[PDB]
Amino acid sequence: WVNAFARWSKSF
Amino acid sequence: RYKRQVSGDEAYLEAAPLAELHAPAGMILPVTSGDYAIPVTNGSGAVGKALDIRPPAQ
Amino acid sequence: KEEVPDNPPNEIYATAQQKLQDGNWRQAITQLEALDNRYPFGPYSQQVQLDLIYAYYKNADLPLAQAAIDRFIRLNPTHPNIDYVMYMRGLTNMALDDRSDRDPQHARAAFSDFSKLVRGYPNSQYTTDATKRLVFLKDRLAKYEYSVAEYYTERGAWVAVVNRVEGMLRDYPDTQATRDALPLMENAYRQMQMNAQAEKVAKIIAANS
Amino acid sequence: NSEEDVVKMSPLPTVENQFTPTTAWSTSVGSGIGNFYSNLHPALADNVVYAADRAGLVKALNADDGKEIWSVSLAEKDGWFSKEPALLSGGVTVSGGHVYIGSEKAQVYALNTSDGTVAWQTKVAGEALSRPVVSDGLVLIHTSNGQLQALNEADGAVKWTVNLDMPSLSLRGESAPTTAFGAAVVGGDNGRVSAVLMEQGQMIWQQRISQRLSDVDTTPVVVNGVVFALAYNGNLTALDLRSGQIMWKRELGSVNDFIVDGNRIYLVDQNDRVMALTIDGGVTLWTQSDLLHRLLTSPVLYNGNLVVGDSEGYLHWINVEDGRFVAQQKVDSSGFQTEPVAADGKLLIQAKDGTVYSITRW
Amino acid sequence: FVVKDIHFEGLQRVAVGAALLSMPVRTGDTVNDEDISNTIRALFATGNFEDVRVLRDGDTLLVQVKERPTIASITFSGNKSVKDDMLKQNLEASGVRVGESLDRTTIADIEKGLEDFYYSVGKYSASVKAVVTPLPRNRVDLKLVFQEGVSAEIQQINIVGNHAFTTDELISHFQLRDEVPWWNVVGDRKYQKQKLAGDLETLRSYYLDRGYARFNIDSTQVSLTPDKKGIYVTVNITEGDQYKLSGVEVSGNLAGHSAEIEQLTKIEPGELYNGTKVTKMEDDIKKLLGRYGYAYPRVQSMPEINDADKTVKLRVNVDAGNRFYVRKIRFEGNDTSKDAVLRREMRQMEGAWLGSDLVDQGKERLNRLGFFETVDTDTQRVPGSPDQVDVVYKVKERNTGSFNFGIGYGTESGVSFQAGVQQDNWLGTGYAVGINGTKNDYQTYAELSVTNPYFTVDGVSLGGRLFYNDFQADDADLSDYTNKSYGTDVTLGFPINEYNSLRAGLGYVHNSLSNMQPQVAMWRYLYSMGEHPSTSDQDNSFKTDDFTFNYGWTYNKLDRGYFPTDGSRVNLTGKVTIPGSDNEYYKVTLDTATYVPIDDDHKWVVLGRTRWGYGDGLGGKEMPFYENFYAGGSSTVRGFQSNTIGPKAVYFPHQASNYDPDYDYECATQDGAKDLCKSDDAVGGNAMAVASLEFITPTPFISDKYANSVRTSFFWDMGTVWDTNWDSSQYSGYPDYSDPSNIRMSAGIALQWMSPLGPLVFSYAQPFKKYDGDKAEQFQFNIGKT
Amino acid sequence: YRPDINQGNYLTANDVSKIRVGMTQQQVAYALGTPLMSDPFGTNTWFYVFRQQPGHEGVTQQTLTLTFNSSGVLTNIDNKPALS
């Protein structure tokens, strides 16, 4: 199992 | 930031007048303390985008 | 990065004025700052400082305008065109204030500045607009007090409500927001069963409306 | 990431050896003293060398072949597992068949030279970093707390104690008192030289020989009623034994012990400068500065030549008349920090690892 | 010498008026050499003049002054271990800073001051050089070059005079360290006075805790080696005997509350003396007094010590001041949020008597709100009133809106794309709004939500939500069926208590199902609903609309929000159908988690988790087959493949809609199927039960420097899921799926580490038991956020 | 799940027994404290109101009206221990 994510958050 | 750009350039508003309060018979209203008083000033100048705020030439 | 060459101050001033008329302000801030730094004691340093006030104000650098105004009023307490500086200070305070439920400290500062202006030089050219702004600020503060009193009416605290309405009557007696607060004080008195005060408030209400 | 130093250590001079040095023998000791500053150095008395380490190991060796006669440890063990090192830091002293040793735990041990059995053990004020001087049936110990104490050789009981003021910051070390004409001259970390009476510890006179700067007398010397004292970053001084009045001084300072012979004084500066001065006015006779910042040890006068160690472990014999280097040898890689011991025609030295060497010439 | 006029030469910044005022001499007065010298010295002392010369011309007194160049900038080069800002702070504290002038004779003084600072921080061989760069208009730049050199470290820490406790144990609790093994990071080996004071205080507290009241530190000594590369620290102390607390006596103006203070002061005779208990009792008495209005109830405690019996008797003096009332409450710094938002979080009421605990609670609530960074409180006094005060709150606002997007990969999900936007404070009103969207290889989801926190004065909250979902089970490790749904929900929330919360609301949903391959359970459900599809080909459509009522309760009592060490958490959710809808059923789910520390340091801990769920229909119909429960995975029971535990699928012999060779079909009539085919495809059930127990250990080989970002544990987890409507009698040739006794068990180890990118998790487990039909997996890697 | 509502001065029921006709305003303030309310409509009168309302249990209010004269000397006192 290789569940992975590359998510970025930017405050506004 | 964006809001402050409105008041400076030209935005202008006018509110309701000032009216005195009457004191019924048999009683007297509290004191005022003279803290927020608008003294009457004579003259008829310019107001509301008709007034130039460019620095005086001195 | 907005570099300024070593041109004579006359051409710099003329170009700055032309752009000011056109409607571009950021350009002349660097120019005037360079002129001041290179010539801290030029024959027209006061005019340089005044133009700095104007450029900072119309370029949205309010803190710099405040600091420069403070320094100027420190250096020259008797300059002939000193009412203009106080008027600009009031405008800067109003711009910072920029919505009657928010903190009114900037409004208080602006009211103080305009009060000093009007009491100082009654025959100037900023007096009419000064009073027109003073009435607006007075109404703003009265409405802030009214909002606080209304919230405390919702909460159920009546001592606070009566104290705040008394303060409003004592401070801002001739504003519209004060006429709409008398029913609140009458209700607060009645809820506590102080019927004599409620009767007096009713007498006051019926004598105007 | 790197490291930088304002000064740079001097290189190893290239000197032809007029006489070829040799090594009579070498013996191994357990762990020596390591990278910890200590005054623990060998001793020689009646053709036998007594050696010790920081842990507590003590050994006796022959002065001719180095064969071990006896060995004994001083580290108490709470069974077969626990073992607390005694942390020996006082110079081994031999006198009257008694071996005096110090420790970092405020413990002074007197052992017998025959079988190594503890003659007695005494508790002192603080750490004993000074040599247990022996004189007039009394043992003078200078502690890290500035307390000069007199113990009994046979009993070890404290007879008298003298309190010396200390600064907030001071160097790691204590001065060894010197006894002469029924008076003990000692120094402290405050840069003051004092004279006391062994009978009751009464202080006779105190003199200041100094110039965040520190200063330690570090075992001044006395000859013919004149006391020569040296401080750290201070001034060398000559004082009257009975009054302490300064007759002459010199703008220099160091900690390592110096030597006086005839009408000459040989001293290594804190900057590793070997200088020979006179004894009357302090005028410098000659100087040698080829060993700058080499962390030299206390020189020893052997066969009319000054023998000095170094951190790198190179032992240098230098002429005394003029200061020309006469020989250089490599002995050990650990390095030399403790002063050598020259006596009875034997030159015994100890390294940081405890490997004692006997040096001869041929 | 009479003076008729005053003239200056060289004045650039200082005005003529200031210089004239500072000069004792003034126009129209006799002047001699002494007065001229005094004026010159006064000009020199002004701090803005370098050279001054006051000479006499033919008639006028002329002063030539060369102003010290004005400092325009201060540069640094060589400050590796010293930050530029702190060094600039030190320089301005000394007096030299931007805007002032430069004294061309104090360069050595500044260099030696900086060298002294380097000596204090630890470096003793540091060198400082000042370079002066003139610039036109009498300006100057002062550059500083630093050769830091080599630092010094502690080589030995020794304690003398301690016999009960070994030196190593005492040093183990000291901030300063002398040994730093390469395999452990316990701290740097530098020396600081603050750290030494902290170590001394820690030693004193440690000695006192054991009853050594007479403990006293004789002195401390610090020494450096001749090479000045090592530091030795020695401490001389004196440990005495212990003491006992004989009793406590109270005397003072208790204001008639003596009866309520004796219980607080109760103790067991002969108990060991302890200052922490005395402080706690004083604080409790202060709080009790403040509960009635008093603001400053001064309390003093003095111990009387008897050495003959070694006893301690505590004397308590109480001085209760006067009541203080609150006149106003002010908020400043809320340039965005309106007054009511901050004012409705208060616990202290304006126009009432004062209480400090209420002020602290209000500050804590404001901090918890999350709209501000720093919160401070002040209590000012009313001029002239001896019993009136005002409370002022100072806050700094923080940005609240956010926008996010990203991509990810998953073994079964494939490539996933996600995006969303949220605003937690809409125009400074407290409203919360959010929108989100997600798409992977098998589903698409779109969500919108709005919420109002204060729908009522008490605190009731009201929220609404809309959602659209499109899902396929082709790659969900289940049977095949395509669903398309959309719906809305409205909810109300009550904070019933500090640690409890309740929710109740309504919802509407619309569902459409298609591509339902022939099967046993699905056909049974359809028959229960009344539909009559054939068992020959896969072509079906089923649309429904439902109205439901939802309820829920939550209890949270954790002591931390991340890596908790002790606490509990419970959650319960439930749903029911309303009459007038095609479906009719109820559903309930419950989750419980608990932590338990073992040692006194809250390091070795035990974790327990339980999860339960059950639902069913009401009016003889059946619960939908898309609301079933599934067990098995990295979140319910590790060691098994995702969604594996539970009943399996059974297919009717049927002809496929379009048969293509080179593939496989389940129970294909075209292939020749004539009897029900068993398989190993998970379908789910309407009852679940899972439990898990974990033991968490500190760490294998890491040190206290980063011991709050890693975790290691060993876990043992069991579970099961089943359906209670399976008819065993009719189908006797297949396992019994209505037996809730086939519990799967497994055990393994896991490690977790928080990283700046995400919470990286690794686990390895081995199922020592498993029933036939279920797969198994060993390694679990989680890398990234969601 | 609501907080407590407290309003007005704190009356201990023992201080109210230390006030009699003939005292001055300073003595009354020393015995009790500064009142939270008065009559700003000309006449001078002090209202000590002690009102409390704990969570969903009711409201309890005690009222004490002190009427002075032009010379700041207590003239009349009215006490209401409960509100109808």
Side-chain angles (χ1 to χ4, degrees), chain F residues 41-56:
Chain F
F41 307 142
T43 185
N44 59 336
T45 302
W46 287 8
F47 301 112
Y48 290 89
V49 172
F50 176 55
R51 197 169 194 264
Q52 47 192 346
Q53 179 184 19
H56 55 57

PDB file of all heavy atoms in Angstrom, chain F residues 41-56:
ATOM      1  N   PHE F  41     -30.919  62.975  36.966  1.00  0.00           N
ATOM      2  CA  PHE F  41     -31.956  63.931  36.576  1.00  0.00           C
ATOM      3  C   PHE F  41     -32.234  64.922  37.709  1.00  0.00           C
ATOM      4  O   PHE F  41     -33.351  65.058  38.205  1.00  0.00           O
ATOM      5  CB  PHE F  41     -33.221  63.190  36.165  1.00  0.00           C
ATOM      6  CG  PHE F  41     -32.995  62.144  35.110  1.00  0.00           C
ATOM      7  CD1 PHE F  41     -33.679  60.944  35.148  1.00  0.00           C
ATOM      8  CD2 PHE F  41     -32.092  62.359  34.085  1.00  0.00           C
ATOM      9  CE1 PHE F  41     -33.470  59.981  34.184  1.00  0.00           C
ATOM     10  CE2 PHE F  41     -31.882  61.399  33.116  1.00  0.00           C
ATOM     11  CZ  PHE F  41     -32.570  60.208  33.168  1.00  0.00           C
ATOM     12  N   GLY F  42     -31.179  65.627  38.110  1.00  0.00           N
ATOM     13  CA  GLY F  42     -31.298  66.685  39.094  1.00  0.00           C
ATOM     14  C   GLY F  42     -31.093  66.247  40.531  1.00  0.00           C
ATOM     15  O   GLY F  42     -30.064  66.561  41.135  1.00  0.00           O
ATOM     16  N   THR F  43     -32.059  65.524  41.092  1.00  0.00           N
ATOM     17  CA  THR F  43     -31.984  65.148  42.496  1.00  0.00           C
ATOM     18  C   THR F  43     -30.893  64.104  42.719  1.00  0.00           C
ATOM     19  O   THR F  43     -30.500  63.369  41.810  1.00  0.00           O
ATOM     20  CB  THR F  43     -33.328  64.608  42.986  1.00  0.00           C
ATOM     21  OG1 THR F  43     -33.256  64.348  44.393  1.00  0.00           O
ATOM     22  CG2 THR F  43     -33.695  63.324  42.259  1.00  0.00           C
ATOM     23  N   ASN F  44     -30.404  64.048  43.957  1.00  0.00           N
ATOM     24  CA  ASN F  44     -29.339  63.130  44.342  1.00  0.00           C
ATOM     25  C   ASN F  44     -29.934  61.981  45.148  1.00  0.00           C
ATOM     26  O   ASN F  44     -30.608  62.208  46.159  1.00  0.00           O
ATOM     27  CB  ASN F  44     -28.261  63.851  45.149  1.00  0.00           C
ATOM     28  CG  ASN F  44     -28.804  64.494  46.405  1.00  0.00           C
ATOM     29  OD1 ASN F  44     -29.991  64.806  46.493  1.00  0.00           O
ATOM     30  ND2 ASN F  44     -27.936  64.698  47.388  1.00  0.00           N
ATOM     31  N   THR F  45     -29.679  60.755  44.700  1.00  0.00           N
ATOM     32  CA  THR F  45     -30.197  59.561  45.349  1.00  0.00           C
ATOM     33  C   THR F  45     -29.288  58.400  44.978  1.00  0.00           C
ATOM     34  O   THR F  45     -28.824  58.317  43.840  1.00  0.00           O
ATOM     35  CB  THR F  45     -31.640  59.271  44.919  1.00  0.00           C
ATOM     36  OG1 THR F  45     -32.472  60.392  45.241  1.00  0.00           O
ATOM     37  CG2 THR F  45     -32.174  58.033  45.618  1.00  0.00           C
ATOM     38  N   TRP F  46     -29.036  57.513  45.936  1.00  0.00           N
ATOM     39  CA  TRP F  46     -28.132  56.387  45.736  1.00  0.00           C
ATOM     40  C   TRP F  46     -28.923  55.088  45.730  1.00  0.00           C
ATOM     41  O   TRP F  46     -29.685  54.815  46.662  1.00  0.00           O
ATOM     42  CB  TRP F  46     -27.055  56.352  46.823  1.00  0.00           C
ATOM     43  CG  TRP F  46     -26.010  57.422  46.671  1.00  0.00           C
ATOM     44  CD1 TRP F  46     -26.023  58.460  45.787  1.00  0.00           C
ATOM     45  CD2 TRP F  46     -24.796  57.550  47.421  1.00  0.00           C
ATOM     46  NE1 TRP F  46     -24.896  59.229  45.943  1.00  0.00           N
ATOM     47  CE2 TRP F  46     -24.127  58.691  46.940  1.00  0.00           C
ATOM     48  CE3 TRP F  46     -24.211  56.812  48.454  1.00  0.00           C
ATOM     49  CZ2 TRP F  46     -22.903  59.111  47.454  1.00  0.00           C
ATOM     50  CZ3 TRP F  46     -22.997  57.230  48.964  1.00  0.00           C
ATOM     51  CH2 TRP F  46     -22.356  58.368  48.463  1.00  0.00           C
ATOM     52  N   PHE F  47     -28.738  54.291  44.679  1.00  0.00           N
ATOM     53  CA  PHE F  47     -29.400  52.998  44.534  1.00  0.00           C
ATOM     54  C   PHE F  47     -28.348  51.903  44.644  1.00  0.00           C
ATOM     55  O   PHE F  47     -27.490  51.769  43.767  1.00  0.00           O
ATOM     56  CB  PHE F  47     -30.136  52.898  43.199  1.00  0.00           C
ATOM     57  CG  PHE F  47     -31.179  53.954  42.995  1.00  0.00           C
ATOM     58  CD1 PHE F  47     -31.007  54.937  42.040  1.00  0.00           C
ATOM     59  CD2 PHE F  47     -32.340  53.955  43.746  1.00  0.00           C
ATOM     60  CE1 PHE F  47     -31.964  55.907  41.845  1.00  0.00           C
ATOM     61  CE2 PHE F  47     -33.301  54.923  43.556  1.00  0.00           C
ATOM     62  CZ  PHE F  47     -33.114  55.899  42.603  1.00  0.00           C
ATOM     63  N   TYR F  48     -28.417  51.119  45.716  1.00  0.00           N
ATOM     64  CA  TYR F  48     -27.605  49.919  45.866  1.00  0.00           C
ATOM     65  C   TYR F  48     -28.464  48.734  45.446  1.00  0.00           C
ATOM     66  O   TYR F  48     -29.414  48.368  46.145  1.00  0.00           O
ATOM     67  CB  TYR F  48     -27.107  49.766  47.300  1.00  0.00           C
ATOM     68  CG  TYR F  48     -26.064  50.783  47.702  1.00  0.00           C
ATOM     69  CD1 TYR F  48     -26.428  52.003  48.252  1.00  0.00           C
ATOM     70  CD2 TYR F  48     -24.712  50.521  47.535  1.00  0.00           C
ATOM     71  CE1 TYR F  48     -25.478  52.931  48.620  1.00  0.00           C
ATOM     72  CE2 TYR F  48     -23.756  51.442  47.900  1.00  0.00           C
ATOM     73  CZ  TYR F  48     -24.143  52.645  48.443  1.00  0.00           C
ATOM     74  OH  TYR F  48     -23.190  53.567  48.808  1.00  0.00           O
ATOM     75  N   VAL F  49     -28.140  48.150  44.297  1.00  0.00           N
ATOM     76  CA  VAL F  49     -28.862  47.007  43.749  1.00  0.00           C
ATOM     77  C   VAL F  49     -27.913  45.820  43.744  1.00  0.00           C
ATOM     78  O   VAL F  49     -26.778  45.927  43.270  1.00  0.00           O
ATOM     79  CB  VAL F  49     -29.393  47.298  42.335  1.00  0.00           C
ATOM     80  CG1 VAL F  49     -29.960  46.037  41.707  1.00  0.00           C
ATOM     81  CG2 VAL F  49     -30.452  48.388  42.379  1.00  0.00           C
ATOM     82  N   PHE F  50     -28.370  44.700  44.292  1.00  0.00           N
ATOM     83  CA  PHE F  50     -27.590  43.467  44.357  1.00  0.00           C
ATOM     84  C   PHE F  50     -28.402  42.404  43.628  1.00  0.00           C
ATOM     85  O   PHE F  50     -29.397  41.911  44.168  1.00  0.00           O
ATOM     86  CB  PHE F  50     -27.309  43.090  45.811  1.00  0.00           C
ATOM     87  CG  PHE F  50     -26.596  41.779  45.982  1.00  0.00           C
ATOM     88  CD1 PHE F  50     -25.393  41.536  45.347  1.00  0.00           C
ATOM     89  CD2 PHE F  50     -27.118  40.801  46.808  1.00  0.00           C
ATOM     90  CE1 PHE F  50     -24.737  40.335  45.516  1.00  0.00           C
ATOM     91  CE2 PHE F  50     -26.463  39.602  46.982  1.00  0.00           C
ATOM     92  CZ  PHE F  50     -25.272  39.369  46.336  1.00  0.00           C
ATOM     93  N   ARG F  51     -28.003  42.069  42.399  1.00  0.00           N
ATOM     94  CA  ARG F  51     -28.788  41.202  41.531  1.00  0.00           C
ATOM     95  C   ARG F  51     -27.913  40.055  41.058  1.00  0.00           C
ATOM     96  O   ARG F  51     -26.789  40.277  40.596  1.00  0.00           O
ATOM     97  CB  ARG F  51     -29.328  41.991  40.335  1.00  0.00           C
ATOM     98  CG  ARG F  51     -30.470  41.334  39.582  1.00  0.00           C
ATOM     99  CD  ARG F  51     -31.091  42.323  38.604  1.00  0.00           C
ATOM    100  NE  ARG F  51     -32.386  41.885  38.094  1.00  0.00           N
ATOM    101  CZ  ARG F  51     -32.573  41.242  36.950  1.00  0.00           C
ATOM    102  NH1 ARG F  51     -31.560  40.917  36.162  1.00  0.00           N
ATOM    103  NH2 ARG F  51     -33.810  40.921  36.583  1.00  0.00           N
ATOM    104  N   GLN F  52     -28.418  38.831  41.176  1.00  0.00           N
ATOM    105  CA  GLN F  52     -27.677  37.664  40.727  1.00  0.00           C
ATOM    106  C   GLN F  52     -28.624  36.663  40.088  1.00  0.00           C
ATOM    107  O   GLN F  52     -29.789  36.539  40.478  1.00  0.00           O
ATOM    108  CB  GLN F  52     -26.897  37.008  41.877  1.00  0.00           C
ATOM    109  CG  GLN F  52     -27.689  36.797  43.149  1.00  0.00           C
ATOM    110  CD  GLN F  52     -26.802  36.435  44.320  1.00  0.00           C
ATOM    111  OE1 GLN F  52     -25.636  36.083  44.144  1.00  0.00           O
ATOM    112  NE2 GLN F  52     -27.347  36.525  45.526  1.00  0.00           N
ATOM    113  N   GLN F  53     -28.100  35.954  39.089  1.00  0.00           N
ATOM    114  CA  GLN F  53     -28.872  34.981  38.319  1.00  0.00           C
ATOM    115  C   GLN F  53     -27.926  33.853  37.932  1.00  0.00           C
ATOM    116  O   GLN F  53     -27.189  33.960  36.938  1.00  0.00           O
ATOM    117  CB  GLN F  53     -29.498  35.615  37.081  1.00  0.00           C
ATOM    118  CG  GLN F  53     -30.301  34.650  36.223  1.00  0.00           C
ATOM    119  CD  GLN F  53     -30.829  35.297  34.959  1.00  0.00           C
ATOM    120  OE1 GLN F  53     -30.331  36.335  34.524  1.00  0.00           O
ATOM    121  NE2 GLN F  53     -31.847  34.687  34.365  1.00  0.00           N
ATOM    122  N   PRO F  54     -27.890  32.769  38.704  1.00  0.00           N
ATOM    123  CA  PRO F  54     -27.109  31.599  38.293  1.00  0.00           C
ATOM    124  C   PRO F  54     -27.811  30.840  37.177  1.00  0.00           C
ATOM    125  O   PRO F  54     -28.978  31.070  36.858  1.00  0.00           O
ATOM    126  CB  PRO F  54     -27.010  30.764  39.572  1.00  0.00           C
ATOM    127  CG  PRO F  54     -28.186  31.170  40.378  1.00  0.00           C
ATOM    128  CD  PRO F  54     -28.455  32.608  40.055  1.00  0.00           C
ATOM    129  N   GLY F  55     -27.066  29.918  36.574  1.00  0.00           N
ATOM    130  CA  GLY F  55     -27.555  29.176  35.428  1.00  0.00           C
ATOM    131  C   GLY F  55     -28.916  28.543  35.629  1.00  0.00           C
ATOM    132  O   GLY F  55     -29.066  27.609  36.423  1.00  0.00           O
ATOM    133  N   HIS F  56     -29.909  29.043  34.900  1.00  0.00           N
ATOM    134  CA  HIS F  56     -31.266  28.494  34.873  1.00  0.00           C
ATOM    135  C   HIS F  56     -31.743  28.093  36.269  1.00  0.00           C
ATOM    136  O   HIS F  56     -32.085  26.941  36.537  1.00  0.00           O
ATOM    137  CB  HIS F  56     -31.357  27.311  33.904  1.00  0.00           C
ATOM    138  CG  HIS F  56     -30.364  26.223  34.175  1.00  0.00           C
ATOM    139  ND1 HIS F  56     -30.281  25.573  35.388  1.00  0.00           N
ATOM    140  CD2 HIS F  56     -29.412  25.670  33.387  1.00  0.00           C
ATOM    141  CE1 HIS F  56     -29.320  24.668  35.336  1.00  0.00           C
ATOM    142  NE2 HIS F  56     -28.778  24.706  34.133  1.00  0.00           N
TER     143      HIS F  56
END
